[model samples]
Target: MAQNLKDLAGRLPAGPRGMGTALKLLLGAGAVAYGVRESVFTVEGGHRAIFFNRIGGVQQDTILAEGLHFRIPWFQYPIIYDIRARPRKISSPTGSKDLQMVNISLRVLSRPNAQELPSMYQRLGLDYEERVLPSIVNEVLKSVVAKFNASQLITQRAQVSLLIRRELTERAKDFSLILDDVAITELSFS
Candidate 1:
């Protein structure tokens, strides 16, 4: 049995660079696999891909849609964005106009504008919510809440919410965020 195994191994081709033949095949296969893996990408359903080049940075007009796509591995890659509606909860602790401390919770519906996605990706990266919206929403809420008395804020929650939505929609446009809807989830006076 040992001689049979030795005879079988001897039939394989010798390595090109003094490595074992099996090891050389493995290295070549790995390099080919790496090239194929990097050359292709998939943009999943409800998502878009923004192409970025090593030299040109982000290609703002080149948003790719769902399905398999090809790219040059050495020169460019894509940044993906989901087009589906996303819910964001924001907690704002600020003073009302009457000097009362108010804690407000908000649910915001947000999605990136497909046409502006490349620009958004270029300027904001993937974590725009963590970096951009919180500050803007916080300030908008504070500014809106401060315009109303503590009791008024509670009684007029819907109105206050509408005001917040209007202001937020206007401001978020500059960043390519589509503010679809806004809801005041929770309110408390302290």
Candidate 2:
């Protein structure tokens, strides 16, 4: 079988021009396919995209909404964001007004501000929550918890959550995160 295949290969056309043209066509087709794949992108439902131009950096003005979008394949890139609200837990251990050690856990529902996503990407990249949430939660938690005594932390738990939610919502706005809901999920005193 191998010898017969080798004999057939020897009898085939040896025209360099034809082979070169065929190879070029194959390469050109492959490149066009690749360019099309890279140049077009889809933003799914509840998601958004940010464009980064190699020449001018992140385009902070226009955010790509859901559906198909196009860009210069090699010179531009897309950063996708899930605009859906996600649950995040923030736990902080701090001292209450009376200097008693307290541990608190907060459950927060958050999503990026779609309009400010470009700036969010510029500042925090894809993992904006990882960078923005912890600090703001800690800041608001510490300050709010500091104002209440250990007993009050338990008694006025509802008010505490309200205060934290209000302050955190405002603080998160500065970072372009929207906090849908903030609730105290766990509390402990030592």
Candidate 3:
């Protein structure tokens, strides 16, 4: 069936030479685009990408900066990292020194560390916020919130806020979390 089509095409004045060149150009362009699609990529501003070679494992030393880069297609791929500091407010329900029910609105400044991004991406994937943030905030806040009453939590935030940062920073590392900062944004009685 294909042979018949080829014969029919040959009979045309614009035979194999014309058709073959056009066909070759189209096929060549398609091949080049497909090859470039995966091998080359761009990381947007305020973001970075970590590379993982299928055989050699995660490439930690080199990171794809915020721009175009080349890779070996399926042999490796890029995991994007948000280099910007991301802020999340978590409300923890706990009792103050007065045994009164209160809510602690904690603002956490967090991002995956640029140097450690490859490991972070390997361990945490993209669900770091949903999976790790809440538990870390709650666990640390619950323990620390007990140290002060509703009034004290609000008034002395300047003093005890470091406690939250210290503890959160240490523990977050185990989950590949990079804590930029932590603060008691607001304390309110329930």
Candidate 4:
């Protein structure tokens, strides 16, 4: 058995040409594997992807849906996003028309506009909610709250909520966001 093993080892290629060929094959396989891994990406459920090209920049024309997608290994990459609606709370202190100080907290259900994802990514990046929602909510709240007195805010709470939802929905469109629901979760006066 030992003699047979020694003969097998000796039979294996020992010359520099053979060693070079082996190294070349190993490197080739590694490169191919790496290329395949880089070329393929998976977008999970409830998620979306956008392509960023090395030369052309973000491809704003198409939004990649959930699935396995392919791209140029070294020249392109995908930016994945969870397109599902998410709830965010925004609280602000503003004065009503009566000059009464009030603290208002809004519960907003929002998600990125799927068709405008590339533009959204260009404008706000991954943290679009943190960047856009708070400011817009504050702006709309201040403007809407100022239009009604404190007494009216309480008396016509439904109207107040409707106005807020309408204004916020319109403002969110500017940022390529969709507001599924917007409600005043908390209201207090000081």
Candidate 5:
């Protein structure tokens, strides 16, 4: 027997009906905080888990914990990021060795030191991308790029981003930040 779309839809559960459902909905708050290796993750309460990083030599995981997190539904679970790798984007200003000014953009593929993001977020906040990324990257660009002539920043971008990564790793250690690779997306010299 073939089922029509209406018939299939009829089988699905309807939205909340009344108070009890609302209570369960509200009860759905952050219950646990841990990392998983599975590519699939389930959202708890109205929240879900996100982010995994390592800090202080200890591995840690993070969850969004506030919305529905739907993954594969049944296969391939998700593990925590562990701060070993992450995808981050930021835009900021840079300077050349000659103090040449430019508006630089960074699209970094990096990971934190694993266990440091909690504290990092604590101080830096959820918007660390805008608040922290720009300043840090800008500093790195100005200091590291200057070592070589202007051409180096343009030609050896990989090495330059690496140098920046090294600096970030050292600076982040104090706050449990383990910086990884940095990829320079755009170096606009104006």
Candidate 6:
């Protein structure tokens, strides 16, 4: 396993070094990060629905409950998606199954779609949200939400992931983002 990982690390497909405006690779993350057991890199859980075989490349995401990880000099790096849980708001109005209009606030639990993030970064840029969020994340959300009346979304919130998955899979063809799972919280109405 170590041998294979070493081989992969040697040929890791990293993007061009350097930031756009600042004009550098941000100096350094550190001289070397010896990722022992139980280390974490903080990342938002929002993009879990957008994971697939290219978060940045072909490597699959290995998010574990407990484990050891590694990174070195400038050769390898690991970005994480806490993928734990979270909440957010959308700028739209929805109607219940009975057709009552209402504004909504929601809490969503999410993880990084680490699988698709590498490729996502490659194609969509390091800060993917700015370049691809509109097409991949926002559009997919709207597409799924539009499928059913508000009541269905509220009542069957658990199944909301299926709709989200279906929508993301369809959208991923363009950016290679994949959907893992989604949790919808607080689907309330006025």
lDDT of each: 0.65, 0.66, 0.64, 0.66, 0.51, 0.47
- Give, for candidate 1, the lowest lDDT window spanning 10 residues: 56-65
Reference-based TM-score of each model = 0.64, 0.65, 0.62, 0.64, 0.41, 0.39
Give candidate 3's TM-score: 0.62
Return the clash pairs for model 3, or none.
97-149
Residue 88 lDDT (model 6): 45
Clashes of 1: 0
The worst-scoring run of ten residues by lDDT in candidate 3 lies at: 56-65
State the lDDT of candidate 1 residue by residue for 1-190, as single tens digits: 3788888787565545556465778879988997766644566456566676667455543343464666555776755544455566766777747765887777656544445556555565545566665777777777787775677767766767777877878777766646456668766666
Model 5 CA lDDT for position 107: 59
lDDT of 3 at 86: 62
By lDDT, is 3 or 6 better?
3
lDDT of 2 by residue, 69-125 (tens): 565467767556554556677667788477557877876665444456665566654
How well does candidate 4 match the true structure in TM-score terms? 0.64
- Name every residue pair that clashes in candidate 4: none
Q: After superposition, how far is residue 25 of candidate 1 from its true place, in Å?
A: 9.7
lDDT of 3 by residue, 1-190 (tens): 3688878765776555677678779877888888766644466455567766667455442333454665546776655545454666766667847766767777666544545555555566445456666777777878887875676655665556777778877877776544466567765664
User: Which tens-of-lDDT digit does each residue in 8-123 have in candidate 5?
Assistant: 78655655466457666655543322234332456443323444333343223432334455554554334333224445665555566655764455554444333444455555
Report lDDT (Cα) of residue 45, candidate 3. 57
